[PDB]
Design a protein around this ligand. Structure first.
Ligand SMILES: Nc1ncnc2c1ncn2[C@@H]1O[C@H](COP(=O)(O)OP(=O)(O)NP(=O)(O)O)[C@@H](O)[C@H]1O
Ligand SMILES: Nc1ncnc2c1ncn2[C@@H]1O[C@H](COP(=O)(O)OP(=O)(O)NP(=O)(O)O)[C@@H](O)[C@H]1O
Ligand SMILES: [Mg+2]
Ligand SMILES: [Mg+2]
Length: 1118
């Protein structure tokens, strides 16, 4: 465990405006806290002048009443509004600083101790925790502490002995608070770690959603999510028990102190030290102070959790990169020529330090000559590029640029002078114009068009209906395989480099397109040096020099609450128990007041023996009620917290199931992206937990207190005015809370922050891409621009919450003061008695304090309405393609494999103007392989997407074994289909689990057999941990050939009747490609295949050869 930061450390992001907002909020909280005890003492001093003509007194007291009401209104408004706005400002600044600190970390930091889900969780949940600490909760804590201090001061003014003996309660409260905060901080640390793991599971599931549904992995993902959430719910159970114990102990100590105060006051009255009224005022003040201490628990609860979260964030924020770019003092060579050398480079990756990738590696790329880096799969090559880009510093060697060590000069102008086309083109979620513009932000439109033209990208871009502004793709999945690669080539070529690195730039392209791109590059590489990694002889022939790499060298209720209750029925037992506890607790509060007020009339009896006996009896009653309050506070808090934990866990499971049940058209939307979906789920769960589950107990307790106050008013026959004043707080609280909830339940602008979260997710998922193009500052600027609208919306919400709290406080104070005036007027005139009114008004004060505690929950209700609307909008949505229709034609156990497409007319939901298929009739024979060929955008992968019902054809019929796939069970039919994705990314797990993802249960021997049949066993066994090696966030800690061989092994261990396959032989050496192709041909004999090929030599015995020309039925015979 890591120790949390100091409380002061929470305020390192405050500026002058934040300081003045915090000061105004603190002044308002202090004045609001002192308003009540000074008001009571002022009435005590006002009684005499009220008894003592009348019109002048009434007018003066009315104007003083108006002044005090205005002061209370302003103070209670500021205490909420200023604190909310200041907390939001500091939280936004801290999020921006966290993103900026994370973005300029080393590359080795992102495959070691941070993931994309980790940063998303830090931006969302930990930041909300820190905000809740520095938001209006701090203002409430200051208000309660001011109330306690004011009560002690006025008690000291009235009776100094009683105030002094009251002052002995603070050490016990301090000890209880310290113990409770320590336990809560540790439990919250563990719970937050578990929740981060669960969020990682969710994000990884959504990112690879096509692979997840293709291999029927929704159930496994849901089970893993539930298993992760079980730990969090157990820690929540423990947290609720700890909170119950703390609140019970605090109430027990406060009530025992009350009884001791009562007995000591009786002793003082026995002598001639103090009279009745002074003890009355002191009892009132001490009661208010104890109630304030009781209500100040949620602030202390949030403080420790947010201290832990802020420690977690500040660990990343204060972390300094080990590369240590020499931005202040670098060489900054002026006229770079192009001579780049690797001299005696000994390099081993930080993730696997034992494996030495390069030993004594020497390679001199000349000033203006091209080097073709031929070599084996998983042997240098892409690592060498990572050395030139300064992704990793060489461990025991040197990298030189024009005879200058790269570590002695800043890497900013390096990456500005290097144009990189990586193995996997990492495209962002913006438009393709912004993706191309990443190379040079300050470029004209004509320059962008020229860069696209030379990179052979203009033809397919101008054909798009939206042109260059086409905003498609999260990982580029809304473009074809070659389109995103050509866009990456255009992006790299726009930034005119002196050194150009092409790590398999051609890779997956059509023959004509590949020739055009390579010729344009050749006429583009005349004056600049280039390092090219390519396993195709076409580029090698044109290359100037060739280097062979071997062995690392060179050779409302109706729609929100009742639906939750129906969903969460099998907890109404626990809730009921907790409910009664809360109710009981509230009763004691009222009851306690009554008892104390009764003692207030015993003090005046001259009979000392009878008075002493009454004092003793009431002291025993108070001790019994104190013990009961202890027990029932513990019970109510523990059970309400277990109810909240069950609520949140069931909500999370239901939301994840709803997300995973949807179709591709849903996932191909800007709102329904992986980082945004994960952030939505996490924020919704956190809001329905903290703002609803943690407030139901206090809501029902205060409601019960107010109702029992009204019931005692009816039983004891109070006047109609008194019961009206008692009822008024209930109506005010109900109206205010309903208004805040409806404000929350109607409208939002969280999508502005959701865009920032998604931008951070893309930036962290593509740290190599953002680093190579020096786009960290651009990402930070876009993040700040996205975060401003949430800042202003939260400003407005804080304004309305402060106004509501202020008006409610003013109404309560006005009602109480008018009641006080009426009661004193009744007593003076003798129309009513005295002791009865005293009990009436003590109970009234307790009820009003409970109502204020209820009113304190406005922002929580607003965010609870937000969360409820979000979760129910997610749940209500119904999918277009149901993953499993119960009433379907059964799938035969031995599927023949007669997959066909008849008159298929298909248009993607996104960009629906383009008609991908116009009357496409493709047929695959039973058990025979079929090859799909054509241009890049002809739709070869669209056929694969149509086979698995990712999207439905508009007017086409896709047929399986002579039966429509629509009338089959989608989950059942998907178990007989095995695919390999076009760009085979892996999950954030081991090789063993990645391969085992293909089949439900496949023990160990089957996994080994699949690995051998994919010719992947050799390198996996050569790894230090074998099949248990962690492969990275998306398989980043592996080469392309190894990743694709692992994907092939997974598709093989699926052992399906219809292996769709694809161009899975790319990114593989000629020998490796031949071995994999021979093994696949041997394994797939007798089973139908729909393999697509870009190199026609691979499909030598593919039987039927089908071309896709004009998106229609082209030649199919051969
Ligand atoms: N971040 C990383 N952590 C650990 N190992 C890594 C990492 N990145 C790459 N490797 C390993 O580096 C080894 C060789 O370097 P690499 O650059 O992947 O080779 P390559 O020859 O370019 N592969 P390929 O493109 O498929 O032909 C592979 O076995 C990888 O598993
Ligand atoms: N989700 C999507 N939304 C919109 N268009 C899409 C989407 N997915 C694919 N496309 C388009 O579908 C067309 C064909 O792409 P694809 O189905 O990958 O064909 P392909 O022939 O397999 N490509 P390639 O591997 O490069 O040869 C392209 O114009 C894509 O931009
Ligand atoms: Mg490579
Ligand atoms: Mg494709």
């Amino acid at each position: 465990e890591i120790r949390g930061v100091a409380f002061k450390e929470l305020f390192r992001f405050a500026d002058g405006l934040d300081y003045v907002l915090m000061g105004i909020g603190s002044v308002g909280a202090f004045v609001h806290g002192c308003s009540l005890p000074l008001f009571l003492r002022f009435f005590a001093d006002l009684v005499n002048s009220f008894g003592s003509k009348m019109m002048e007194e009434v007018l003066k007291y009315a104007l003083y009443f108006l002044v005090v009401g205005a002061a209370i209104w302003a103070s209670s408004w500021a205490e909420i509004s200023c604190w909310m706005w200041s907390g939001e400002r500091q939280t936004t600044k801290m999020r921006i600083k966290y993103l900026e600190a994370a973005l300029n970390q080393d590359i080795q930091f992102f495959d070691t101790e941070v993931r994309t889900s980790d940063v998303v969780f830090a931006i969302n949940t930990d930041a909300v925790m820190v905000q809740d600490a520095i938001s209006e909760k701090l203002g409430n804590f200051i208000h309660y502490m001011a109330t306690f201090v004011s009560g002690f001061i006025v008690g000291f003014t009235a009776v100094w002995q009683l105030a002094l003996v009251t002052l002995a309660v603070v050490p016990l409260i301090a000890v209880i608070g310290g113990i409770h905060t320590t336990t809560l901080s540790k439990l919250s640390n563990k719970s937050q770690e578990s929740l981060s793991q669960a969020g990682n599971i969710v994000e990884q599931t959504v990112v690879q959603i096509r692979v997840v549904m293709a291999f029927v992995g929704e159930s496994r993902a849901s089970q893993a999510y539930s298993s992760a959430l079980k730990i969090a719910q157990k820690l929540g159970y423990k947290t609720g028990l700890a909170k119950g114990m703390g609140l019970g102990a605090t109430y027990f100590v406060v009530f025992c102190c009350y009884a001791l105060l009562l007995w000591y006051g009786g002793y003082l009255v026995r002598h001639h030290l103090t009279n009745g009224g002074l003890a009355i005022a002191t009892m009132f003040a001490v009661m208010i102070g104890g109630l304030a201490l009781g209500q100040s628990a949620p602030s202390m609860a949030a403080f420790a959790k947010a201290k832990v979260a802020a420690a977690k964030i500040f660990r990343i924020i204060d972390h300094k990169p080990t590369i240590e770019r020499n931005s202040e003092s670098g060489v900054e060579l002026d006229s770079v020529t192009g001579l780049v050398e690797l001299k005696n480079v000994d390099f081993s990756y930080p993730s696997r330090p034992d494996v030495k990738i390069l030993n004594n590696f020497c390679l001199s790329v000349p000033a203006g000559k091209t080097i073709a880096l031929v070599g084996s799969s998983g042997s240098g090559k892409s690592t060498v590029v990572s050395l030139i880009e300064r992704f990793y510093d060489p461990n025991s060697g040197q990298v030189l640029l024009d005879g200058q060590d790269l570590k002695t000069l800043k890497l900013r102008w390096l990456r500005q002078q290097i144009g990189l086309v990586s193995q996997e083109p990492a495209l962002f979620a913006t438009s393709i114009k912004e993706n191309i513009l990443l190379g040079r932000p300050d470029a004209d439109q004509v320059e962008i068009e020229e860069a696209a033209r030379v990179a052979n990208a203009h033809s397919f871009i101008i054909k798009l209906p939206d042109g260059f502004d086409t905003q498609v793709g999260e990982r580029g999945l809304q473009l074809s395989g070659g389109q995103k690669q050509r866009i990456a080539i255009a992006r790299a070529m726009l930034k005119n480099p002196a050194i150009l690195l092409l790590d398999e730039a051609t890779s997956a392209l059509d023959s004509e397109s590949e020739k055009l791109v390579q010729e344009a590059l050749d006429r583009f590489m005349i004056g600049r040096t280039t390092l090219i990694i390519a396993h195709r002889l076409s580029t090698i022939r044109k290359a100037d020099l060739v280097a062979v790499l071997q062995q690392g060298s060179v050779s409302d209720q109706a729609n929100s609450f009742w639906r939750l209750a129906k969903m969460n029925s099998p907890e109404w037992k626990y809730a009921l128990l907790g409910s009664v506890g809360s109710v009981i607790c509230g009763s004691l509060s009222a009851f306690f007041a009554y008892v104390l007020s009764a003692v207030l009339s015993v003090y005046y009896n001259p009979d000392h023996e009878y008075m002493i006996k009454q004092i003793d009896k009431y002291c025993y009653l108070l001790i019994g009620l104190s013990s009961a309050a202890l027990v029932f506070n513990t019970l109510q808090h523990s059970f309400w917290d277990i109810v909240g934990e069950n609520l949140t866990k069931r909500v999370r499971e239901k939301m994840l199931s709803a997300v995973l049940k949807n179709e591709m058209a849903w996932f191909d939307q800007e709102e329904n992206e992986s980082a945004r979906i994960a952030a939505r789920l996490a924020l919704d769960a956190n809001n329905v937990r903290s703002a609803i589950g943690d407030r139901i107990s206090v809501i029902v307790q205060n409601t019960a207190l107010m109702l029992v106050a009204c019931t005692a008013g009816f039983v004891l026959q109070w006047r109609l005015a008194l019961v009206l004043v008692a009822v008024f707080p209930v109506v005010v609280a109900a109206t205010v809370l309903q208004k805040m909830f409806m404000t929350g339940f109607s409208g939002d602008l969280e999508a502005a922050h959701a865009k920032g979260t998604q931008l951070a997710g893309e930036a962290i998922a593509n740290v190599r891409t953002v680093a190579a193009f020096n786009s960290e500052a651009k990402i930070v600027r876009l993040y700040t621009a996205n975060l401003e609208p949430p800042l202003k919306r939260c400003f407005w919400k804080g304004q309305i919450a402060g106004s509501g709290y202020g008006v409610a406080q003013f109404c309560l104070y006005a009602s109480y003061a008018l009641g006080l005036w009426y009661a004193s007027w009744l007593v003076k005139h003798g129309i009513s008695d005295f002791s009865k009114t005293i009990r009436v008004f003590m109970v009234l004060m307790v009820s009003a304090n409970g109502a204020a505690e209820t009113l304190t929950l406005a922002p929580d209700f607003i965010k609870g309405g937000q969360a409820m609307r979000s979760v129910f909008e997610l749940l209500d949505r119904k999918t277009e393609i149901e993953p499993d229709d119960p009433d379907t034609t059964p799938v035969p156990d031995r599927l023949r494999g007669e997959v066909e497409l008849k008159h298929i007319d298909f248009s993607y939901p996104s960009r629906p103007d383009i008609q991908i298929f116009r009357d496409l009739s493709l047929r695959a024979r039973a058990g025979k392989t079929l090859a799909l060929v054509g241009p890049s955008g002809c739709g070869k992968s669209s056929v694969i997407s149509l086979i698995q019902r990712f999207y439905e054809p508009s007017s086409g019929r896709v047929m399986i074994d002579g039966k429509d796939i629509r009338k089959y069970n989608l989950k059942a039919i998907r178990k007989h289909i095995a695919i390999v994705p076009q760009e085979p990314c892996l999950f954030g797990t081991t090789i063993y689990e990645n391969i085992a993802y293909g089949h439900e249960c496949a023990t160990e021997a089957e996994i080994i057999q699949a690995a051998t049949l994919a010719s992947a066993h050799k390198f996996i066994s050569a790894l230090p941990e074998g099949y248990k090696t962690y492969v990275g966030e998306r398989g980043v800690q592996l080469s392309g050939g190894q990743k694709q061989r692992i994907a092939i092994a997974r598709a093989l261990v699926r052992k399906a009747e219809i292996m769709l396959l694809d161009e899975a032989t790319s990114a593989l050496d000629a020998e490796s490609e031949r071995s994999v192709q021979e093994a696949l041909d041997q394994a797939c004999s007798g089973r139908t295949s729909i393999v697509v090929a870009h190199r026609l030599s691979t499909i030598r015995n593919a039987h039927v050869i089908a071309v896709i020309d004009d998106g229609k039925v082209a030649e199919q015979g051969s």
